[PDB]
Amino acid sequence: MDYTVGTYLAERLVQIGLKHHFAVAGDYNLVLLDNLLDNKNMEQVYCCNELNCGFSAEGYARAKGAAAAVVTYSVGALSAFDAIGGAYAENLPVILISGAPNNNDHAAAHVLHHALGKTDYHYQLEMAKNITAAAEAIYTPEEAPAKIDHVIKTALREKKPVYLEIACNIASMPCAAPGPASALFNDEASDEASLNAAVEETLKFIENRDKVAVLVGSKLRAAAAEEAAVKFADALGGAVATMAAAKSFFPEENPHYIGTSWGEVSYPGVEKTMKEADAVIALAPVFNDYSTTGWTDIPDPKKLVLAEPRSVVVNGIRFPSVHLKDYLTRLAEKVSKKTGALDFFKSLNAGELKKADPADPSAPLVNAEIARQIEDLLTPNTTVIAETGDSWFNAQRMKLPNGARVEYEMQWGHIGWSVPAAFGYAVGAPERRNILMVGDGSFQLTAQEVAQMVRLKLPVIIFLINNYGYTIEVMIHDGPYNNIKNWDYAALMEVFNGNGGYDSGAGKGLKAKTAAELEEAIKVALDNTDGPTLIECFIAREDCTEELVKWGERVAAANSRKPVNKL
Amino acid sequence: MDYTVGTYLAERLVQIGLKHHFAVAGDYNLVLLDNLLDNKNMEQVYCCNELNCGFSAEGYARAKGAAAAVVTYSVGALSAFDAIGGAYAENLPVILISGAPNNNDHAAAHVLHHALGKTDYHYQLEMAKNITAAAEAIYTPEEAPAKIDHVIKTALREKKPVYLEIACNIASMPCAAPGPASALFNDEASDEASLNAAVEETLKFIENRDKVAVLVGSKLRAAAAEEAAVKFADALGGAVATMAAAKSFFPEENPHYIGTSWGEVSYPGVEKTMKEADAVIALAPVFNDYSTTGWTDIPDPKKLVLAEPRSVVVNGIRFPSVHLKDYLTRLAEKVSKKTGALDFFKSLNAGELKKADPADPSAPLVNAEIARQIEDLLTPNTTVIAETGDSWFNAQRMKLPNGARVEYEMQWGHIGWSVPAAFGYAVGAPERRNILMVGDGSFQLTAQEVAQMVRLKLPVIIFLINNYGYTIEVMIHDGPYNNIKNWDYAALMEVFNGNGGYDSGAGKGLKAKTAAELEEAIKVALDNTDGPTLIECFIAREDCTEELVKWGERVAAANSRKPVNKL
Amino acid sequence: MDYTVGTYLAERLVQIGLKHHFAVAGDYNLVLLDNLLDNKNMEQVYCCNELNCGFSAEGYARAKGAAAAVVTYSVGALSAFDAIGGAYAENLPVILISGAPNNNDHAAAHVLHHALGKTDYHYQLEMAKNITAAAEAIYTPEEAPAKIDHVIKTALREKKPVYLEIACNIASMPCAAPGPASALFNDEASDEASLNAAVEETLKFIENRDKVAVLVGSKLRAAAAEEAAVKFADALGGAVATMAAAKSFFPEENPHYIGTSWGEVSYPGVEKTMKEADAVIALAPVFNDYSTTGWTDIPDPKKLVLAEPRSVVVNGIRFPSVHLKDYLTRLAEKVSKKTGALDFFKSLNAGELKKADPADPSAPLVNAEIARQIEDLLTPNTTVIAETGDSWFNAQRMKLPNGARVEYEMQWGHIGWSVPAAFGYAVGAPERRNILMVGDGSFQLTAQEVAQMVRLKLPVIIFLINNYGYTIEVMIHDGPYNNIKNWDYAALMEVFNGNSGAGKGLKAKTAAELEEAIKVALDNTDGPTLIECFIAREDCTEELVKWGERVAAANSRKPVN
Ligand SMILES: Cc1ncc(C[n+]2csc(CCOP(=O)(O)OP(=O)(O)O)c2C)c(N)n1
Ligand SMILES: Cc1ncc(C[n+]2csc(CCOP(=O)(O)OP(=O)(O)O)c2C)c(N)n1
Ligand SMILES: Cc1ncc(C[n+]2csc(CCOP(=O)(O)OP(=O)(O)O)c2C)c(N)n1
Ligand SMILES: [Mg+2]
Ligand SMILES: [Mg+2]
Ligand SMILES: [Mg+2]
């Protein structure tokens, strides 16, 4: 096979496991989209706008491990940067590829469409560098293979997005062919002395600390260490809790799992157990303002073993070049049984998380009953995409059967992420039962991507929580800016179906205002195999989780804290 | 009055003539939105998402001369950058204001929500610098007045957008009060020797060049020179044509106006007249790939007097510090009558632009009949917002009564601009008859802002041209990426009306598939004073202007031209 | 004439008043330098290295108002960027012009010499943006006129440096001709309503505040407001003090001048007078960690009228678009006598700054005796260039006759600035008596530029203070890094003469030898004279010792939490 710039790119994308890429056409990328189309192992999937394109790829990367979005110069790329910064924040290897000017137009005093009106076309690459792990511009075909391979290998190694731009007049130009896929995953092994030392220091730290807790963090999947963490936890026999953003990164039917650790909104018993543990082994955590409940819940530095994806800090020593999967595997082999924290937890009799009983059939639907019927739908083959909003807290409360997944975007927190993310996740994982839980406010930012779920016949079940505005903001600091224009969300499904011809779309929009209506809507949803089903769930503005009220206050307090003295 | 950081900002915004600013709430900006709310001379207007917020402000600036958009850190700002780069490209002073972290969180090793996961919060400011004329971060209240005043004065002087970020814990902090508004508009006068010299060189250039044409450019309004250009044109008595993006920047009922100059898609006679003029006086032009019809129509460097907003290049000499309004005023006083090109044009008998007759009532609607009935609606109090797409060419063909305005975004060309731009323009110019002409493809990127037109009861008349995909791209280079998922656009209006209660919205969605149905829909539209009216106009995919086909080919040719030899 | 990119630039430089520009050749700028040589209204002056080239321009801008430096791509420009940041810090319009790659090598996958080994040639320009007021790359001739005019106007407007790069294959290419010089000096006027209101608010503020002190700041010359400050001071009749970096920006023989304000190292009576004043009118100040003596001396916000070059903050109102020269001119016309702080100062009997009597001729030379003899050299036609180090404090103690200038680089504080800065200043102001006061440590960074003073026959008198290392650092925080390799500094003159040069190098180890050396220096009209003065490491001003401790305490203060 002879390759071109564009087919080289396509082949590399297929080699890292992509079966799809996402795109929005524009004149600087059309020839490149033609070359990408030429690859018989990938589908090209079209999006409504470039933010949504970016977020669709982000969601795909959650299903498949990586993804790619293709956009046009400047007008496409700048909005897509928002999503790419999201991918950086969520440790996902999304490859952003932009069209770019004709290579003759550089340093030529040419003013070009889509650009600033100046004759300088480096600004986009410049901007990209701030929000990616690698960023390259391809101006000539000879430089294409090296630049492509560099950004792909970096994305996969770092679990971060990357940027490529390609001149619009070279995508069909010949270049070298790509070598074997195995080269792209090539990575450092753990330094063996370091691995051994980190594990041994961990044993010397816990030799006389029998109450050991394990804190599962939101970078565990990025480190491909989820399986190793179960092995470690089973050997240790300690208490295992998840940070809020790590929901589903540890099997909840495992007898060592005690629930969520999230400060004053932890599951019952957990906060106590963590306070009175002698050692906390944290596996790939992100400690931020949200995850620490407005800086009120910070791990005790005297007890913390900090095992990150590529380093361990233990017993006052930093060990770089120790991969978490390797650390956990070896530690699982060497560690003795340390059941103390878990014994402490059970002796608490703090009970299980208190959950409401089934609602009466005709009563007004409430937040707690929606959460109950959703929890009832969960299977080992289910993924729930949970938006920023009260849905964060509802999803957190659900008991997951082993195998069920939850997808959160808690580090970036872009409301509206969820709709294109669920689209892209559903493209990538069509075998799964894919459930989207999204608030009305969020939905409005990105709603149009539901039309793509319709176009592709994806059977996503969408729970749209219609509480008439931004209830999480209401619980941080209220004002007129938290009110939104209400829509007939259910009716939007018919809009996306088109001229309404039978072949034009099989989306369904339903309304649920009672428990009985919700039951019946769920039934219709599960039977709709040809398209998405949006269930518009009606509840009161302030009918939210107890957790949200408490977390919201501590967040408003951290954000507003006064400046300290600087002289 | 005692001021705070935030009320200082609000007051400056009011002083430059804003009566509105646009916003999307988020926790890093809520206190700042409260301070901005405290100003009794401005409305705070909420948007669905941050791209749309940015574009709403862009549209407002077309109505009012400047604008402001307020967004949250990182998740809001990065998408809004797309719109801000648009404002830069279209020479509009939009002030982007972002919320930002608590000022205690800098250089503190704190990981914060909405950010990349790192502990460095300068990246947004860095990115902003590439697409603005000034960009400042406010970390302390003492630095607020200077930074605010700097970015505002720069925006107004340069007719370019600017960036401010404000730490979330200082918006209510006291600071100095603002001085008089007059300080903000303070600008250089023309250098008198330069002004005199530029005008005199222009007379010596045209002394023996009697066939003088005037080419009105898309930076004429930015230079506030529209009125001066009429004075000059009337004194000269030459032929005056507009570049495509300068439609409505010169009164079309003026007897010296000959139509559009746009290469092979010029109005009849114009191309000939420009070829055989001896001098072309270009007033604030932008010569780009689109405006030159894929580089096939470049002005003759031997004939060109180049009068830009702040400089004139004439008779081989560059004169900086000569303001276009001043140049035109003085030139109008000194120039003799030079009627030659206009005499040449009339002697062409090239006739007027050929326009179709009224359609039969029941026949399938065609592109040309939509253009006809829209042209029939134009009054001196009308503005037409014309999207990138075939709507560029339809709008170009319309005969404007003096006073009527057309708004184009031809330099940036972000499809979807038009919907939030029309929202913001209609907020700013509610007295006008505001008409939006938008294609189906474009509409899908930003459709949700129609809900804000509903919320605010704005009587915008929207002509949605439903030709089942991206017809302009079809005419550049066709592929599967130009097909889109069709919607029931008309039905979307009921969605935005909400629970459909009488007080919930007065948007109307109508369908037009024949000339008669279009007439009747226009009537209903004009009678709907309480909300927007969307008229979904159905036509064939390839039923487009002749102009688009011709321009599309030359553009595809310029974009794809082969690389030249570099050694 | 027909213009080229290069000659357009040349003409613009001549229009802004340059009679010289400074250069270091390299293959990417040679054509450009030829084009600059076409214009015979300025001379092209060559420098040893690009750091020194930049600082030569910086000192020329002190003498003439603006300057230019020309360097080669990457290897020249990156080091020159330290001088350009320096110019930005010191408010000087220096135009840095770099040669750049052939315009065919952009977006071509070509690796070029002097670059990073990649194929991207935008990095220099991106770097420059961080330290300039404007920065433009010229890749085609048709774009040159607008880019050139934009950076020049910007430099003059903002009083800051700017950056241009010009592709090496386009410098001789035709372009449009430049218009009138007048266009380049077209600044906005003050907003009249704001000017009037700011003056009116100032008159309100001081209505019942008779004890009015005037604090003269280091951005007064950038504001072109020195003459206006004298008019205001003469009308007001209050006490005037200069900030350290503003030495010579106010005539010291004026009866309203009370000396230096600089915290605990102020002239006697000044610190008290400032504390007693009811209003302090600060004229273009820069309040930084050094100028506030480690943040120990900050103006009382309740008494401060802050008149910056382009704005005034007074009575809790900010007034942009008010130019200080105009503010001072108007205020001088309107203000009534406010003598109270000057009465207070006199009433104090604090005395004049105490200064040492002549030393015993044959005793070992001491720092105070060096300062006394230099002070005795000062005339109205004198400029002293004072290096970072104890020379800052010795110069600060000198009583200037009206007309005498001091050049300081206190914001940037790059040791070694003084040598090429004195070279460039002496090229721009050859009529003046130009004295360089420079320490041994500083001298060693940039010494080679004395060879250019020899080449051009500039009669710069150089007092090299040989105190065997970095005393200013000894007095902040001592360690082995303050010791340097000693040189025979006097013998360096002969090296720079070659085997063709009239530099003189002399040694002074007593007061009599210093007296004799200075006579020889004054008689040497054909080249520079370096006088190597030997003093003990710790023989420094008392002021350095006090200010040093305060700086160290500010630098090392603990993180707050
Ligand atoms: C793009 C973006 N803009 C603004 C915000 C700030 N923000 C955080 S949660 C929220 C409200 C979400 O409302 P909804 O989706 O209705 O969920 P609810 O809180 O009502 O449960 C907002 C505006 C954000 N996170 N991202
Ligand atoms: C944000 C953005 N993405 C992609 C493009 C490329 N583009 C230019 S015109 C066009 C099609 C617009 O289609 P429509 O609005 O339906 O107008 P029609 O051409 O059918 O008249 C596209 C995708 C763009 N200009 N801006
Ligand atoms: C380029 C540069 N490097 C390092 C420093 C730090 N520094 C400040 S003063 C000084 C010593 C000055 O030595 P000298 O010129 O001998 O003067 P003295 O202090 O002995 O009077 C140093 C190293 C600096 N200011 N600039
Ligand atoms: Mg909500
Ligand atoms: Mg269309
Ligand atoms: Mg020394």
Residue numbers in the entry:
A (entry chain A), B (entry chain A): 1 to 567
C (entry chain B): 1 to 499, 504 to 565
From the primary publication:
Pyruvate decarboxylase (PDC) converts pyruvate to acetaldehyde through nonoxidative decarboxylation, a reaction that typically occurs in anaerobic fermentations. PDC self-associates to form a 260 kDa dimer of dimers, with two active sites buried at each dimer interface. In addition, the monomeric unit of PDC is composed of three distinct structural regions. In this study, we used iterative computational protein design to rationally engineer the mesophilic enzyme, pyruvate decarboxylase, to exhibit enhanced thermal endurance at the growth temperature of a thermophilic organism.
A significant increase in thermal stability is observed with PDC2.03, which combines PDC1.01, PDC1.10 and the additional four substitutions. PDC2.03 contains sixteen mutations in the monomeric unit and sixty-four mutations in the homotetrameric complex. The mutations are found throughout the PDC complex as well as in each of the three structural regions of the monomeric unit. The structure of PDC2.03 was refined to a resolution of 1.67 Å with R and Rfree of 0.170 and 0.203, respectively. There are two molecules in the asymmetric unit in complex with TPP and magnesium. Each monomer has three domains with an open α/β topology with several ethylene glycol and sulfate molecules on the surface. The backbone root-mean-square deviation (RMSD) between chain A of the wild-type PDB and PDC2.03 is 0.19 Å. The largest conformational difference, located in the upper left of Fig. 5c, is located at a crystal contact point and distant from both the active sites and any of the 16 mutations. Thus, the mutations impart significant enhancement in thermal stability without unintended structural alterations. PDC2.03, which displayed no loss of molar ellipticity until 90 °C when monitored by CD, lasted 60 min at 60 °C before entering phase 2, and never entered phase 3 for the duration of the experiment.
